[PDB]
Amino acid sequence: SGPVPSRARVYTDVNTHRPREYWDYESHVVEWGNQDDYQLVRKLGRGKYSEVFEAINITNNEKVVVKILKPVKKKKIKREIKILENLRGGPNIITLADIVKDPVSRTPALVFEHVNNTDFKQLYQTLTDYDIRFYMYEILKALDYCHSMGIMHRDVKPHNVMIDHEHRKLRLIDWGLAEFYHPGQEYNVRVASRYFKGPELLVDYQMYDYSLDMWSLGCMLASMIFRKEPFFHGHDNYDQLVRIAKVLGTEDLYDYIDKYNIELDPRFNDILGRHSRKRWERFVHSENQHLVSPEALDFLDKLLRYDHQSRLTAREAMEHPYFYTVVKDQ
């Protein structure tokens, strides 16, 4: 008959109670800043959709990050801009400062607050048990904020978390794939990076919600505590589900597709097979011992569920025993 509907357990109708202007991004009017305000200093990186530069605001000699957009549908640019403006001032959310027309690409360039960051390459190297708890807690603040505001990030992974370790300061960035949550809406499943895609995305269940972000956060945590980056390292979208299935087992997977009456791709038949659910202990060795605790495993288990309804919400996560010691400190 087709798949069973679903709604977010939390923040279900927040957008419905807003004025349409809040989520009706297609009708947002960009008000352009002055592109001569900013002088480019050096290239920071290349994205799928942007070139990223360090720049100076000459009017006030402050350091900024400029994201020059590749050509993309104006719809998508209005979205990102709208989401960024709705979220401004929220905890650990990157601040958009200005928006300008690049004279050379004739495309938008978003201008962000500068964040002096340590590379997750050289960072997930040096992190103590406490650091991970602290930063995950900081990420959860950002995710509970943006979910409470009717927005799912849809691209949570280590690249999108900026940490200034010297200042113990964290920002969730790259809001380019983020969407407004509406009960009943069927989303594109071609979001997130492979290693971070929820099972919902992999079996093509379009009526997903904020809980997607919680899976992704599970993948990050797994890779930090067990020191295997990325944790679920599939070579393509089908191999990804099989890698998950090999840890979480096939019984719950098939239970999941059953509950939601999901029609599984015939390609998946010959490859999923039959796998038991593994105990987390099998990833604990002497190099990662000091980051793994019973608290940490209980928490990770509660994030990494096929059934998106059963995963913790950002808010429930934040009150898990794993964070008791960081909560007391603040």
Coordinates of C-alpha atoms in Angstrom, one line a residue:
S1 CA 0.0 0.0 0.0
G2 CA 3.1 2.2 0.4
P3 CA 5.0 3.2 3.5
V4 CA 3.6 4.0 6.9
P5 CA 3.6 7.8 7.8
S6 CA 5.8 9.2 10.6
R7 CA 6.1 12.4 12.7
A8 CA 8.8 13.8 15.0
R9 CA 8.2 12.8 18.6
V10 CA 9.2 16.3 19.6
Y11 CA 9.0 19.8 18.1
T12 CA 6.4 18.4 15.7
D13 CA 4.4 21.6 14.9
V14 CA 6.8 24.4 15.8
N15 CA 6.8 25.6 12.2
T16 CA 3.0 25.5 11.9
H17 CA 2.8 28.0 14.8
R18 CA 5.3 30.4 13.2
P19 CA 4.3 33.1 10.7
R20 CA 4.7 31.7 7.2
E21 CA 7.6 34.1 6.6
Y22 CA 9.7 32.0 9.0
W23 CA 9.8 28.8 6.9
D24 CA 8.5 30.0 3.5
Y25 CA 12.0 30.7 2.3
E26 CA 11.2 30.8 -1.4
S27 CA 9.7 34.3 -0.7
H28 CA 12.7 35.6 1.3
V29 CA 14.2 38.8 -0.2
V30 CA 18.0 39.1 0.1
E31 CA 19.2 42.5 1.2
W32 CA 22.8 42.8 -0.1
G33 CA 25.8 44.1 1.9
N34 CA 28.7 45.9 0.4
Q35 CA 31.2 43.7 -1.3
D36 CA 34.0 46.3 -1.1
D37 CA 33.7 45.9 2.7
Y38 CA 35.7 42.7 2.4
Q39 CA 39.2 42.1 1.0
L40 CA 40.1 38.5 0.5
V41 CA 43.3 37.3 2.3
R42 CA 43.8 33.6 1.5
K43 CA 41.8 30.5 0.4
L44 CA 40.8 28.2 3.3
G45 CA 39.3 25.3 1.3
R46 CA 37.2 24.0 -1.5
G47 CA 33.7 22.6 -1.0
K48 CA 31.2 20.8 -3.2
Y49 CA 29.2 24.0 -3.3
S50 CA 31.7 26.7 -2.2
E51 CA 35.1 28.2 -2.2
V52 CA 36.0 29.4 1.4
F53 CA 38.3 32.3 2.1
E54 CA 39.8 34.2 5.0
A55 CA 39.0 38.0 4.5
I56 CA 39.2 41.3 6.2
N57 CA 36.3 43.7 6.8
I58 CA 38.1 46.9 6.1
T59 CA 35.5 49.1 7.6
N60 CA 36.3 47.7 11.1
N61 CA 39.5 45.7 10.6
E62 CA 37.9 42.5 11.8
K63 CA 38.8 39.0 10.5
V64 CA 36.0 37.1 8.6
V65 CA 35.3 33.9 6.7
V66 CA 33.8 34.3 3.2
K67 CA 32.0 31.5 1.5
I68 CA 31.7 32.1 -2.3
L69 CA 28.9 29.9 -3.6
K70 CA 29.1 27.8 -6.7
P71 CA 26.2 28.1 -9.0
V72 CA 23.1 26.5 -7.3
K73 CA 19.4 27.1 -7.5
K74 CA 18.4 30.4 -5.9
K75 CA 15.8 28.3 -3.9
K76 CA 18.7 26.5 -2.1
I77 CA 20.5 29.8 -1.4
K78 CA 17.4 31.4 0.0
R79 CA 17.0 28.4 2.2
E80 CA 20.5 28.5 3.7
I81 CA 20.3 32.2 4.2
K82 CA 16.9 31.9 5.9
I83 CA 17.9 29.1 8.2
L84 CA 21.1 31.0 9.1
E85 CA 19.2 34.1 10.0
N86 CA 16.5 32.2 12.0
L87 CA 19.3 30.5 14.0
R88 CA 21.5 33.6 14.6
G89 CA 22.4 34.0 18.4
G90 CA 21.6 30.3 19.1
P91 CA 24.2 28.4 21.1
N92 CA 27.2 27.2 19.1
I93 CA 25.5 28.0 15.8
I94 CA 27.8 29.8 13.3
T95 CA 26.9 33.5 12.9
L96 CA 26.2 34.9 9.4
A97 CA 27.4 38.5 9.4
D98 CA 26.7 39.6 5.9
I99 CA 25.8 38.5 2.3
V100 CA 27.3 40.0 -0.8
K101 CA 27.6 39.6 -4.6
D102 CA 31.0 38.2 -5.7
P103 CA 32.2 40.6 -8.5
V104 CA 34.2 37.8 -10.1
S105 CA 31.7 34.8 -9.9
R106 CA 28.6 37.1 -9.9
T107 CA 27.2 34.7 -7.2
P108 CA 26.4 35.1 -3.5
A109 CA 29.2 35.1 -1.0
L110 CA 28.1 34.5 2.6
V111 CA 30.2 36.2 5.2
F112 CA 30.7 34.4 8.5
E113 CA 32.1 35.1 11.9
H114 CA 35.7 33.9 11.9
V115 CA 36.5 30.6 13.9
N116 CA 40.2 29.7 14.5
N117 CA 40.0 26.0 14.4
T118 CA 42.0 22.8 15.1
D119 CA 41.9 20.2 12.3
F120 CA 39.8 17.1 13.3
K121 CA 42.7 15.2 11.8
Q122 CA 45.1 16.6 14.5
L123 CA 42.2 16.9 17.1
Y124 CA 40.5 13.5 17.4
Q125 CA 44.1 12.6 18.0
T126 CA 44.6 14.5 21.3
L127 CA 41.1 14.3 22.9
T128 CA 40.6 13.0 26.5
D129 CA 37.5 11.2 27.7
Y130 CA 36.4 14.5 29.2
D131 CA 37.0 16.6 26.1
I132 CA 34.7 14.3 24.1
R133 CA 31.9 14.5 26.7
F134 CA 32.3 18.3 26.7
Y135 CA 32.2 18.8 23.0
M136 CA 29.4 16.3 22.4
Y137 CA 27.4 18.2 25.0
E138 CA 28.2 21.5 23.1
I139 CA 27.0 19.9 19.9
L140 CA 23.8 18.7 21.5
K141 CA 23.1 22.3 22.6
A142 CA 23.3 23.4 18.9
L143 CA 21.1 20.5 17.8
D144 CA 18.5 20.9 20.5
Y145 CA 18.4 24.6 19.6
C146 CA 18.0 24.2 15.8
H147 CA 15.4 21.3 16.3
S148 CA 13.4 23.4 18.7
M149 CA 13.4 26.1 15.9
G150 CA 12.0 23.6 13.4
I151 CA 15.2 22.9 11.5
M152 CA 17.1 19.7 10.9
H153 CA 20.8 20.1 10.0
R154 CA 21.0 17.0 7.8
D155 CA 24.8 17.1 7.5
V156 CA 26.3 16.5 10.9
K157 CA 29.9 15.1 10.6
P158 CA 33.3 16.2 11.9
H159 CA 34.1 18.6 9.0
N160 CA 31.0 20.6 10.0
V161 CA 32.0 21.0 13.6
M162 CA 34.5 23.8 14.2
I163 CA 36.4 23.6 17.4
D164 CA 38.7 26.2 18.8
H165 CA 40.3 24.0 21.4
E166 CA 42.5 26.7 22.9
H167 CA 39.2 28.6 23.8
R168 CA 37.0 25.5 24.3
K169 CA 34.6 27.0 21.7
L170 CA 32.6 25.0 19.2
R171 CA 30.4 26.0 16.2
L172 CA 28.0 24.0 14.1
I173 CA 28.6 25.2 10.5
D174 CA 27.6 24.4 6.8
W175 CA 23.9 24.9 6.9
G176 CA 23.6 24.3 3.2
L177 CA 21.6 21.1 3.4
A178 CA 19.4 22.0 6.4
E179 CA 15.6 22.0 6.0
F180 CA 12.5 23.1 7.8
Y181 CA 10.7 20.3 9.4
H182 CA 6.9 19.8 8.6
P183 CA 4.8 16.9 9.8
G184 CA 3.9 14.7 6.7
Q185 CA 6.6 16.1 4.4
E186 CA 8.6 13.7 2.2
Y187 CA 12.3 14.8 2.0
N188 CA 15.1 14.1 -0.4
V189 CA 17.2 11.2 0.9
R190 CA 20.3 12.4 -1.0
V191 CA 21.6 14.4 2.0
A192 CA 24.4 13.9 4.5
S193 CA 27.8 12.2 3.8
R194 CA 27.7 8.4 3.2
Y195 CA 29.4 7.5 6.4
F196 CA 26.9 9.6 8.3
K197 CA 23.7 8.8 6.5
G198 CA 20.9 7.3 8.7
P199 CA 19.3 3.9 7.8
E200 CA 16.2 6.0 6.8
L201 CA 18.2 7.6 4.0
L202 CA 19.7 4.3 2.9
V203 CA 16.4 2.3 2.5
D204 CA 14.7 5.4 1.0
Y205 CA 12.3 6.4 3.7
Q206 CA 11.4 10.0 2.9
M207 CA 9.3 11.0 5.8
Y208 CA 12.1 11.4 8.3
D209 CA 12.7 14.2 10.8
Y210 CA 15.2 15.7 13.4
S211 CA 16.2 12.3 14.5
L212 CA 18.3 12.0 11.4
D213 CA 20.8 14.3 13.0
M214 CA 21.0 12.0 16.1
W215 CA 22.1 9.1 14.0
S216 CA 24.9 11.2 12.5
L217 CA 26.0 12.2 15.9
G218 CA 26.1 8.5 16.8
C219 CA 28.6 8.0 14.0
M220 CA 30.7 10.8 15.2
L221 CA 30.8 9.4 18.7
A222 CA 31.5 5.9 17.7
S223 CA 34.5 7.2 15.7
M224 CA 35.8 9.3 18.6
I225 CA 35.5 6.7 21.5
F226 CA 36.7 3.8 19.4
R227 CA 39.2 5.8 17.4
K228 CA 38.2 4.6 13.9
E229 CA 37.4 7.5 11.5
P230 CA 35.0 7.3 9.9
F231 CA 33.3 4.5 12.0
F232 CA 31.0 3.1 9.3
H233 CA 33.2 3.2 6.2
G234 CA 31.0 2.1 3.3
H235 CA 32.2 2.4 -0.2
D236 CA 28.8 3.4 -1.6
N237 CA 25.2 3.6 -0.3
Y238 CA 24.4 -0.1 -0.4
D239 CA 27.7 -1.1 1.2
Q240 CA 27.0 1.5 3.9
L241 CA 23.8 -0.2 5.1
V242 CA 25.6 -3.6 5.0
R243 CA 28.4 -2.2 7.3
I244 CA 25.7 -0.9 9.7
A245 CA 23.9 -4.3 9.5
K246 CA 27.1 -6.1 10.4
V247 CA 27.2 -4.2 13.7
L248 CA 23.5 -3.7 14.6
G249 CA 22.4 -7.0 13.1
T250 CA 19.8 -7.8 10.5
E251 CA 16.9 -8.7 12.8
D252 CA 16.1 -5.1 13.9
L253 CA 16.7 -3.9 10.4
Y254 CA 14.0 -6.2 9.0
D255 CA 11.8 -5.3 12.0
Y256 CA 12.3 -1.7 11.0
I257 CA 11.4 -2.1 7.3
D258 CA 8.4 -4.1 8.5
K259 CA 7.0 -1.5 11.0
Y260 CA 7.1 1.2 8.3
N261 CA 6.2 -1.1 5.4
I262 CA 9.3 0.1 3.5
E263 CA 9.8 -1.5 0.1
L264 CA 13.4 -2.6 0.0
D265 CA 15.5 -2.2 -3.2
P266 CA 15.9 -5.6 -4.9
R267 CA 19.7 -4.8 -5.0
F268 CA 19.8 -5.2 -1.1
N269 CA 18.5 -8.8 -1.2
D270 CA 21.6 -10.5 -2.2
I271 CA 23.9 -8.4 0.0
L272 CA 22.4 -7.8 3.4
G273 CA 22.3 -11.5 4.4
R274 CA 22.0 -12.3 8.1
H275 CA 24.0 -10.7 10.8
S276 CA 23.8 -10.8 14.6
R277 CA 23.9 -7.6 16.7
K278 CA 27.4 -7.2 18.1
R279 CA 28.5 -6.2 21.6
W280 CA 30.4 -2.9 21.6
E281 CA 33.2 -4.6 23.4
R282 CA 34.5 -6.0 20.1
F283 CA 35.8 -2.5 19.2
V284 CA 37.5 -1.9 22.5
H285 CA 41.3 -2.4 22.4
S286 CA 44.3 -0.9 24.3
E287 CA 44.6 2.3 22.2
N288 CA 40.9 3.4 22.7
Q289 CA 40.3 1.9 26.2
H290 CA 40.7 5.2 28.0
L291 CA 37.7 6.8 26.1
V292 CA 35.2 4.0 26.4
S293 CA 33.1 3.6 29.5
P294 CA 29.8 1.9 30.3
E295 CA 28.1 5.3 30.3
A296 CA 29.6 6.0 26.8
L297 CA 28.4 2.7 25.4
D298 CA 24.9 3.0 26.8
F299 CA 24.6 6.5 25.3
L300 CA 26.0 5.4 21.9
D301 CA 23.5 2.5 21.8
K302 CA 20.7 4.8 22.4
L303 CA 21.7 7.0 19.4
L304 CA 22.3 4.3 16.9
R305 CA 18.9 2.7 16.2
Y306 CA 17.3 1.9 12.8
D307 CA 13.9 3.0 14.0
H308 CA 14.4 6.8 14.0
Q309 CA 11.5 7.1 16.5
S310 CA 13.5 5.1 19.2
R311 CA 16.7 7.3 19.1
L312 CA 17.3 9.8 21.9
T313 CA 16.3 13.4 21.2
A314 CA 19.0 16.0 21.6
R315 CA 17.3 17.0 24.9
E316 CA 17.2 13.4 26.4
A317 CA 20.8 12.9 25.3
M318 CA 21.8 16.0 27.2
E319 CA 20.6 14.4 30.4
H320 CA 22.3 11.0 29.9
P321 CA 24.8 9.9 32.7
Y322 CA 27.7 10.3 30.3
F323 CA 27.4 14.1 30.7
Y324 CA 26.7 14.2 34.5
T325 CA 30.3 15.4 35.1
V326 CA 30.2 18.1 32.4
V327 CA 26.8 19.3 33.7
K328 CA 28.1 19.7 37.3
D329 CA 31.1 21.8 36.0
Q330 CA 28.9 24.4 34.3

